Amino acid sequence: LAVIPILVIACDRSTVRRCLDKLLHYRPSAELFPIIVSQDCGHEETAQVIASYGSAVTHIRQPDLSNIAVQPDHRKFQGYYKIARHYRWALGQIFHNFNYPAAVVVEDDLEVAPDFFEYFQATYPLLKADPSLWCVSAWNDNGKEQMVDSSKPELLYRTDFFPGLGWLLLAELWAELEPKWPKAFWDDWMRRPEQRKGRACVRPEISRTMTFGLKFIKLNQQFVPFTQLDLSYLQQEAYDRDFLARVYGAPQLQVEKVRTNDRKELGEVRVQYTGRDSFKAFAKALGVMDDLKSGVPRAGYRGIVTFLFRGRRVHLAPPQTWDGYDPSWT
Ligand code: MMC
């Protein structure tokens, strides 16, 4: 077992209480999962709420509350500049001042699943061992109830789309990102290829975080003992052979046949897309997120979006000749 801090990003919402109450209720050990609450903004009521938890958490305060000079295209986005400054300061605190080896980053509007800690404890060794991974996330971007298999709460995947929303990173990655941290829109900046460098994140079939106060993502409620499972299938070499053979070995169905629930005997199928317009159209037809960041679809892996549709496993996939993302798919 390893020590992994939880870094909570807070500011001016008193409801950080709900976030902390759930983290503290499910935390298995204070020693294994120290909680550090970084509060920006100087909102007095929120500070009093965090302080009331005492030694159960460590309360740190972003020091520079000044307004930030924004570029000419960003007059409406001061808040995004402040968020980026806060993340830079808080992550620096976690990795430089506290000297932790990794951290799970969570925002104050997230509620955790019962197995949130078990999940990160089990996946941290994979992140440490596989250089092709750069994070573990608790979030399934297409995680609404009707799109996930409730009988497979233990199932995990690789994704090229950095989901944020409860994510684990190594101190080594902060060393790489810190020198070029952006002025604003930090998460979309991490999604650019110049930052991602082809690396993936682990993500679950059923989300381990949910937002409150995205609202339709289902929070897992069945505890899965991930530390007792064999997660070797997530190693790049095994995954890229087996999961891909599975996707391309599955029968192909036209999107309208999947939409209307035709050929129900086929419990796992592939819907093939061929260009940006067909991807957007097919994703919309099947109720899957259709937006792309730097050409990567939500929850996509080698261009493949996997989800459940009317109880059937569906892989919305490009032709197997796929060889990289095109950022122009906007
Ligand atoms: C997870 Hg707050």
Curated annotation (Swiss-Prot):
It is found in: Golgi apparatus membrane; Cytoplasm, Perinuclear region. It is a single-pass type II membrane protein. Residues 1-330 are lumenal. Substrate binds at residues 13, 40, 86, 108. One of its GO terms (biological process) is in utero embryonic development. Its EC number is 2.4.1.101. GO terms for molecular function: alpha-1,3-mannosylglycoprotein 2-beta-N-acetylglucosaminyltransferase activity; manganese ion binding; protein N-acetylglucosaminyltransferase activity. Disulfide bonds join 11-41, 135-201. GO terms for cellular component: Golgi medial cisterna; Golgi membrane; perinuclear region of cytoplasm. Pathway: Protein modification; protein glycosylation. Its main location: Golgi. The active site is at 187 (proton acceptor). Mn(2+) binds at residue 109. It catalyses: N(4)-(alpha-D-Man-(1->3)-[alpha-D-Man-(1->3)-[alpha-D-Man-(1->6)]-alpha-D-Man-(1->6)]-beta-D-Man-(1->4)-beta-D-GlcNAc-(1->4)-beta-D-GlcNAc)-L-asparaginyl-[protein] (N-glucan mannose isomer 5A1,2) + UDP-N-acetyl-alpha-D-glucosamine = N(4)-{beta-D-GlcNAc-(1->2)-alpha-D-Man-(1->3)-[alpha-D-Man-(1->3)-[alpha-D-Man-(1->6)]-alpha-D-Man-(1->6)]-beta-D-Man-(1->4)-beta-D-GlcNAc-(1->4)-beta-D-GlcNAc}-L-asparaginyl-[protein] + UDP + H(+). Its cofactor is Mn(2+). Keywords: Cytoplasm, Disulfide bond, Glycosyltransferase, Golgi apparatus, Manganese, Membrane, Metal-binding, Signal-anchor, Transferase, Transmembrane, Transmembrane helix. Coiled coil: none annotated. The keyword Calcium does not apply. The cofactor is mostly bound to the substrate. Belongs to the glycosyltransferase 13 family. Initiates complex N-linked carbohydrate formation. Essential for the conversion of high-mannose to hybrid and complex N-glycans. Interacts with MGAT4D. Interacts with BRI3. This is Alpha-1,3-mannosyl-glycoprotein 2-beta-N-acetylglucosaminyltransferase. The chain holds residues 105 to 447 of 447 of the full protein.
